[PDB]
Design an enzyme around this catalytic site. Structure first.
Site, PDB file in Angstrom:
ATOM      1  N   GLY B  29      21.217 -29.451   5.922  1.00  0.00           N
ATOM      2  CA  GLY B  29      22.260 -28.938   6.712  1.00  0.00           C
ATOM      3  C   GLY B  29      22.118 -27.579   6.847  1.00  0.00           C
ATOM      4  O   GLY B  29      21.208 -27.193   6.032  1.00  0.00           O
ATOM      5  N   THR B  30      23.408 -26.955   7.551  1.00  0.00           N
ATOM      6  CA  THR B  30      23.264 -25.883   8.542  1.00  0.00           C
ATOM      7  C   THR B  30      24.295 -24.929   6.778  1.00  0.00           C
ATOM      8  O   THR B  30      24.795 -25.369   5.836  1.00  0.00           O
ATOM      9  CB  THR B  30      24.419 -25.861   9.147  1.00  0.00           C
ATOM     10  OG1 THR B  30      25.865 -26.339   8.837  1.00  0.00           O
ATOM     11  CG2 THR B  30      23.271 -26.434  10.174  1.00  0.00           C
ATOM     12  N   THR B  31      23.360 -23.659   6.978  1.00  0.00           N
ATOM     13  CA  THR B  31      24.066 -21.829   6.320  1.00  0.00           C
ATOM     14  C   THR B  31      26.057 -22.231   6.626  1.00  0.00           C
ATOM     15  O   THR B  31      25.493 -22.519   7.833  1.00  0.00           O
ATOM     16  CB  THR B  31      23.898 -21.330   6.798  1.00  0.00           C
ATOM     17  OG1 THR B  31      22.389 -21.343   6.403  1.00  0.00           O
ATOM     18  CG2 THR B  31      24.495 -20.442   5.830  1.00  0.00           C
ATOM     19  N   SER B  32      26.560 -22.646   5.590  1.00  0.00           N
ATOM     20  CA  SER B  32      27.745 -22.740   5.646  1.00  0.00           C
ATOM     21  C   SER B  32      28.023 -22.113   4.459  1.00  0.00           C
ATOM     22  O   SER B  32      27.504 -22.403   3.701  1.00  0.00           O
ATOM     23  CB  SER B  32      28.051 -24.818   5.842  1.00  0.00           C
ATOM     24  OG  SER B  32      27.918 -24.823   6.733  1.00  0.00           O
ATOM     25  N   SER B  74      29.062 -29.416   4.798  1.00  0.00           N
ATOM     26  CA  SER B  74      26.563 -29.697   5.171  1.00  0.00           C
ATOM     27  C   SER B  74      26.026 -30.971   4.373  1.00  0.00           C
ATOM     28  O   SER B  74      26.303 -31.418   3.465  1.00  0.00           O
ATOM     29  CB  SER B  74      26.219 -28.970   3.697  1.00  0.00           C
ATOM     30  OG  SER B  74      26.893 -27.241   4.575  1.00  0.00           O
TER      31      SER B  74
END
Ligand SMILES: Nc1ncnc2c1ncn2[C@@H]1O[C@H](COP(=O)(O)OP(=O)(O)O)[C@@H](O)[C@H]1O
Ligand SMILES: [Mg+2]
Lengths: 241, 243, 233, 297, 250, 88
Positions: B29-32, B74
């Site tokens: 998943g994305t950089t959060s 994420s």
């Protein structure tokens, strides 16, 4: 093997699953200590100090289940929480059912019975945590009951848990023979904590800061956690060795 | 092993193989990130723009919960969206009964038990998302993150996804500069730079920066998306220093 | 990897990617082509009505769901059905109880969830069918794509099923033209015809096969065929 | 023990109060307790190795204590408490402790005084096993000389032998030898020859042949003579003494070989006649040195 | 290893003897040597206890639990299965005989009700047999002193003498040689200690050895004296000191 | 040359423990014979490869000055007897 997986009796007739839970409860490497003073029950656990991304204080292994009764947990954290619910819950329900505060001994018995039900449940995988209840009991005074992941349970004069449990036990054994009783010396609640802190440092060989410990103290009608700074008052004389 | 072919068997590892796999997915998943401040929190997320046919700020990843709990997640999008939705239902019951908004650690506990059961049982597939959540309740500001393991702790910084490595490094400055946490307006600007440098690890697609906050001094301790001019300005700060 | 791990929804590969999911996607590729697009004021779906043989009637794959709603299928026929009746149900509940038409976005969040429940569960079916849903609410025209994954995405224009390559390119090009075009039903409907020709290997251009639906701020959900689609063909 | 600021403060501090050391030295004269106290707090800081900086002020203090017939009594007391607490880095303090020991020998402050202080020290410092342990041995050798005069020689021998069986590589090779050899002489006096024989076995005979052990080589073989000869073992006596002559210094010089070789002749004949006797005696025959004596020949 | 039929408890084994049931016996063997001797005027049950950890309290480990005040039980096996089974024994008995017939069960009836529970943890698939085999020793009026074994299968048998655990072989033969039912109880207690003493000789101290009798009433331990007709407790558990007295009589 | 006993680190403890086992019965079988025990022969070492079990064997051999034969058997490994028969 399929033989490893079956919840029902293994060919040995002693479960593989049970040996496995015993493996688990040393992944975290928490050395904990619980002793019985005269009128005080001291529980100590390493408070890990992680990176700044987590707060250090928040991280804990000592939990206040109910009045008088504290619980130290050894073995993985998410399963710790699962277990914790059921014990807090029953203390309340007992008080409703029976109109008096639950004794220590009876809470441990309930949880052994739930442990055994888990291996009769096919879907369920047995909880792989150690629940050690400490309290100043209603009748019996200082009390230590250690509960195993399998569901075996037994009382204690003193105990330690961990992979390095062995070293601590020896000191406590010899101490009690010289003192010729089963209680840590001094009526005073304060200095028994310090005798516990000291004996933890010896056995392990590692000096621990206030940062590296957490001290939960049982008195009559409360279990409560000391301040960070309270710990230090003891630690300072000891620290020069 | 056969422990990967039968959920919820005690491995000699002590953790079932499937649950471990589930964690691995968080990374895809994305950089959060999340930043704990001195009187609130900031949530910030990199939302990759898939194509020109994608529509600005309409499938926003940031989701509102309660009226004071800010939430982003994420990993498996489908799994997380159900989990956030589950979360409101729980909060709902809490509000009716006790006539009070949920404390943020109350919220963490409740979610904690839900995850736990769904891994202890064969029948229910382990969850495979890490959720950053919190805001400003009665006990003020908190930032918690919920592992799919079912551990949760208090934090002062959170970072997850692929580019967490970049993110953690930039977060160490925050603590040294202020044990308090940075001022909530100024931390909007820092947060953009963190997402932008960590988009140099996820540059292969375009991205849009989305920030939100729940802050007592600039939001009155209710949840809001930071939009418009504050948002466009934040991008410039970041662009200027990475030049 | 037949059986073992990834053979059932619960069991993870080490990496944690279900192989089954990609197969459910493959069902869409095997599926009937459809091109969807919009403008702010209208949402236009064009679908080729598949048939077995000459005597078999050209079968509608565009289904009106509600007066102000409708969907088209590409993928497994039984799954689309269980889902479609559910769409209808939810829209009715809101109109009755809460007054409002069910918003298109908010219906999608529920639809996502329903797909994830079957992925949690021992057994059951993750829905193996992808749906282009168009609708007119108080936010105006929308177009969603529902994936077998569950994910709902607001897109200006997208196409699913067979040979998507020609129409996707076509949409990218004419993107700017149909989004500016509003207040013109007839022109949106033209754009959409032109789009589906690119995807096809010129299988048919007949009035008889293409069926066009439109719902927006102007037209209600109406199905257009024969003569009405002969204007634009 | 966390926190890094204690490290820095503590060193600077030592410097400040080491310039102030004359005030502390002079205070001792008025009261030994006022002088100790200033320093004990410095060395009681929470971090470890806080003893190392501070211990410079203590090096000058442990002299003041040693150097008055009253004050060495206060000296014995302290060093004990520091040892019990942790040891606080086994290096740090223990350099000072060793020097306390080193000092007794050179004090010359009367036989009585010397005896009291050693009995106190050796007991505490038993725990250590590094540098202090070498110095323990050396300072126990004082009690061993005192007791050698006495009939309390039997008790003395045991403490000494007990020390050196314990393996040391801290010691050089020359030093470990000297202590074992002395033992063997005490065990001659005690009357336990089998004890002296057991010790001998662990003393490598290869080492003595190296030329820095030339002096030791003579001593070891002379001592061996003693063990056998009481117990009338004439055969061994011959062998030992032969190896004395093969010592290179002996071999060279006329005078030094003369009584050594005369002694061999007596022990060969004294052994009962037979076969060992023949092969040995004819080596002497080979050898022009015995023929340069004539009574013998 | 074994068949998938024999692991299953819903499936007739080839042999017809489950693998399961056989596992339950392997575990019984692995546990403590527990015995029972029947006398004219008593029953004595006796066992050794697990030494466990050094600092674990021995007292709290109880291998003799009173089911009713007049009927005790002894087992070989695991702690967890023992306790759960034990709550079930008392509970089912209250329902079916302490409210119906408003009195304590005959020993035979209680033994019958314990078998049924056992039987159900073997019938239902996916639920393993109780990990424990009992002796239920007891006293009731109608059928006097009585001695039983209840198997985790859910078959039960009365005996003159039986012993279970590792040292079952040894013990049974010793009882035969030295004793028969017609002999008095007093003799059997001394005998039983000696028998258990073969088992282990490192410690035989009365701390690690739990010895009880079911015999005569104790009208003292009725606990609401002044009414004599109610039977006192038949069971009386003998303290460590009491054991030690009985060791100098050997 | 002796592998420097200082440059053995973190297993300092191992060297000293060892000579009890090895040095006393090697130099004098006499002491163990009089003591009354069969003299010990056969010692088994074991550690994850690269902790220097071989290295420790060498360390002790130099101190005593006893002769030293290091034979790897993985350098001569075969099925049936051949080259191994000659060597041993
Ligand atoms: N105690 C140690 N001191 C120094 N280096 C070490 C130590 N243990 C291992 N090594 C290094 O690793 C190298 C290889 O280990 P080796 O002697 O082949 O051991 P083993 O028989 O356990 O495989 C050593 O030669 C040395 O360079
Ligand atoms: Mg090797």
């Amino acid at each position: 093997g399929y033989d490893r997986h079956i919840t029902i009796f293994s060919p040995e007739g002693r479960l593989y699953q049970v040996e496995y839970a015993f493996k688990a409860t040393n992944q975290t490497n928490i050395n904990s200590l619980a002793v019985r003073g005269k009128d005080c029950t001291v529980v100590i656990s390493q408070k890990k100090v992680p990176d700044k991304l987590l707060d250090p204080t928040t991280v804990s292994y000592i939990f206040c289940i109910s009045r008088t009764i504290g619980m130290v947990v050894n073995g993985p954290i998410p399963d710790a929480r699962n277990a914790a619910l059921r014990a807090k819950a029953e203390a309340a329900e007992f008080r409703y059912k029976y109109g008096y505060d639950m004794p220590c001994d009876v809470l441990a018995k309930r949880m052994a019975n739930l442990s055994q039900i888990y291996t009769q449940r096919a879907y369920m995988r047995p909880l792989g945590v150690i629940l050690t209840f400490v309290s100043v009991d209603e009748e019996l005074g200082p009390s230590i009951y250690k509960t195993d992941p399998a569901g075996y349970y037994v009382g204690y004069k003193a105990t330690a848990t961990g992979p390095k449990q062995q070293e601590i036990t020896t000191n406590l054994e010899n101490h009690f023979k010289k003192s010729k009783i089963d209680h840590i010396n001094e009526e005073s609640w304060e200095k028994v904590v310090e005798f516990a802190i000291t004996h933890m440092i010896d056995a392990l060989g590692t000096e621990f800061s206030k940062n590296d410990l957490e001290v939960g103290v049982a008195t009559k009608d409360k279990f409560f956690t000391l301040s960070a700074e309270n710990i230090e008052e003891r630690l300072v004389a000891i620290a020069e060795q | 092993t056969g422990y990967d072919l039968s959920n919820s068997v005690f491995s000699p590892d002590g953790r079932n193989f499937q649950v471990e796999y589930a964690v691995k997915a968080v990374e895809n998943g994305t950089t959060s990130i999340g930043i704990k401040c001195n009187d609130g929190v900031v949530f910030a997320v990199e939302k990759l723009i898939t194509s020109k046919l994608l529509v600005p700020q309409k499938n926003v990843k940031i989701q509102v919960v309660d009226r004071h709990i800010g939430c982003v997640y994420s990993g498996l999008i489908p799994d997380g969206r159900h989990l956030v939705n589950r979360g409101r239902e729980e909060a709902a019951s809490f509000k009716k009964l006790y006539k009070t908004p949920i404390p943020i650690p109350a919220f963490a506990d409740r979610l904690g038990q839900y995850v736990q059961a769904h891994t202890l049982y064969n029948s229910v597939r382990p969850f495979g998302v890490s959720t950053i959540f919190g805001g400003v309740d009665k006990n003020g500001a908190h930032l918690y993150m919920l592992e799919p393991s079912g551990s949760y702790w208090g934090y002062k910084g959170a970072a997850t996804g692929k580019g967490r490595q970049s993110a953690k490094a930039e977060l160490e400055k925050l603590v040294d500069h202020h044990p308090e946490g940075l001022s909530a307006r100024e931390a909007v600007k820092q947060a953009a730079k963190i997402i932008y440098l960590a988009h140099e690890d996820n540059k292969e697609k375009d991205f849009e920066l989305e920030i939100s906050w729940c802050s007592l001094s600039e939001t009155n301790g209710l949840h809001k998306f930071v939009k418009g001019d504050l948002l466009q300005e934040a991008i410039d700060f970041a662009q200027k220093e990475i030049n | 990897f037949r059986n073992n791990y990834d053979g059932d929804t619960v069991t993870f590969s080490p990496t944690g990617r279900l192989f089954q999911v990609e197969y459910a996607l493959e069902a869409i590729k095997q599926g009937s082509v459809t091109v969807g697009l919009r403008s702010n004021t209208h949402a236009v779906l064009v679908a080729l009505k598949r048939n077995a043989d000459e005597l078999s009637s050209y079968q509608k794959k565009i289904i009106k769901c509600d007066e102000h709603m409708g969907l088209s299928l590409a993928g497994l026929a039984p799954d689309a059905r269980v889902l479609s009746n559910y769409l209808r149900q939810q829209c009715n509940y809101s109109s009755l109880v809460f007054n409002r038409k069910l918003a298109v976005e908010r219906a999608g969040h529920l639809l996502c969830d329903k797909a994830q429940k079957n992925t949690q569960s021992y057994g059951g079916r993750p829905y193996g069918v992808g749906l282009l849903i168009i609708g007119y609410d108080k936010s105006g025209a929308h177009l969603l794509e529902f994936q077998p994954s569950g994910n709902v995405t607001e897109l200006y224009g997208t196409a699913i099923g067979a040979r998507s390559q020609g129409a996707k390119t076509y949409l990218e090009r004419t993107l700017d033209t149909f989004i500016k075009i509003d207040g013109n039903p007839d022109e949106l409907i033209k754009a959409g015809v032109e789009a589906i020709s690119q995807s096809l290997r010129d299988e048919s251009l007949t009035v008889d096969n293409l069926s066009i639906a439109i719902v927006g701020k102007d037209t209600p959900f109406t199905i257009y065929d024969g003569e009405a689609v002969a204007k634009y063909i | 023990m966390s926190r890094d600021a204690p490290i820095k403060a503590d060193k600077d501090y030592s410097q400040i109060l080491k310039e102030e050391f004359p005030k502390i030295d002079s205070l001792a004269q008025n009261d030994c307790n006022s002088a100790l106290d200033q320093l004990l707090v410095l060395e009681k800081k929470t971090r470890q190795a806080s003893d190392l900086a501070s211990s410079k002020e203590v090096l000058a203090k442990i002299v003041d204590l040693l150097a008055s017939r009253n004050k060495w009594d206060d000296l014995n007391e302290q060093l004990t408490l520091l040892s019990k607490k942790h040891g606080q880095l086994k290096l740090s303090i223990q350099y000072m402790i060793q020097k306390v020991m080193e000092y007794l020998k050179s004090s010359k402050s009367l036989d009585l005084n010397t005896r009291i202080s050693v009995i106190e020290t050796i007991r505490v410092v038993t725990e250590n096993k590094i540098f202090v342990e070498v110095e323990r041995a050396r300072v126990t050798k004082d009690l061993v000389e005192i007791k050698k005069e006495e009939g309390k020689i039997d008790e003395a021998a045991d403490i000494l032998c007990e020390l050196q069986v314990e393996t040391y590589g801290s010691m050089e090779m020359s030093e470990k030898i000297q202590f074992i050899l002395e033992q063997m002489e005490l065990s001659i006096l005690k009357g336990d020859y089998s004890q002296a024989t057991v010790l001998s076995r662990k003393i490598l005979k290869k080492t003595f042949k190296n030329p820095k052990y030339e002096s030791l080589k003579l001593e070891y073989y002379n001592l061996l003579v003693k063990i056998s000869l009481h117990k009338r073992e004439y055969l061994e006596v011959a062998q030992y003494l032969q190896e004395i002559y093969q010592t290179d210094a002996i071999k060279s010089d006329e005078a030094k070989w003369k009584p050594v070789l005369s002694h061999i002749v007596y022990f060969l004949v004294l052994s009962p006649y037979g076969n060992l006797q023949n092969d040995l005696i004819h080596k002497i025959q080979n050898d022009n040195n015995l023929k340069k004596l004539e009574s013998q020949e | 290893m074994t068949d998938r039929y024999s692991f299953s408890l819903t499936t007739f084994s080839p042999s017809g003897k489950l693998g399961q049931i056989d596992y339950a016996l392997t575990a019984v063997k692995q546990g403590v040597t527990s015995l029972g001797i029947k006398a004219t005027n008593g029953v004595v049950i006796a066992t050794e206890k697990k030494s466990s950890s050094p600092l674990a309290m021995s007292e709290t480990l109880s291998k003799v639990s009173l089911l009713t005040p007049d009927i005790g039980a002894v087992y070989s096996g695991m702690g967890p299965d023992y306790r759960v089974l034990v709550d079930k024994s008392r509970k089912v008995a209250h329902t079916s005989y302490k409210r119906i017939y408003g009195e304590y069960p005959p020993t035979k009836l209680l033994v019958s009700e314990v078998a049924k529970i056992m039987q159900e943890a073997t019938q239902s698939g996916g639920v393993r047999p109780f990990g424990v085999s009992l002796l239920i020793a007891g006293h009731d009026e109608f059928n006097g002193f009585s001695l039983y074994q209840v198997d985790p299968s859910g078959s039960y048998f009365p005996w003159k003498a039986t012993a279970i655990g590792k040292g079952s072989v040894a013990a049974k033969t010793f009882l035969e040689k030295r004793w028969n039912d017609e002999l008095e109880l007093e003799d059997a207690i001394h005998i039983a200690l000696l028998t258990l003493k073969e088992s282990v000789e490192g410690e035989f101290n009365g701390d690690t050895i739990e010895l009880a009798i079911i015999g005569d009433e104790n009208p003292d331990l009725l606990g609401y004296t002044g009414i004599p007709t109610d039977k006192g407790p038949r069971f009386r558990k003998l303290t460590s000191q009491e054991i030690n007295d009985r060791l100098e009589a050997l | 040359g002796e592998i420097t006993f200082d440059g053995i680190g973190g297993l300092t403890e191992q060297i000293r423990e060892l000579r009890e086992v090895i040095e006393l019965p090697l130099k004098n079988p006499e002491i163990f014979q009089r003591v009354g025990i069969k003299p010990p022969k056969g010692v088994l070492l074991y550690g994850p490869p690269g902790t220097g079990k071989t290295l420790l064997a060498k360390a002790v051999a130099a101190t005593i000055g006893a002769n030293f034969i290091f034979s790897p058997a993985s350098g001569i490994v075969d099925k049936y007897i051949g080259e191994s028969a000659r060597i041993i």
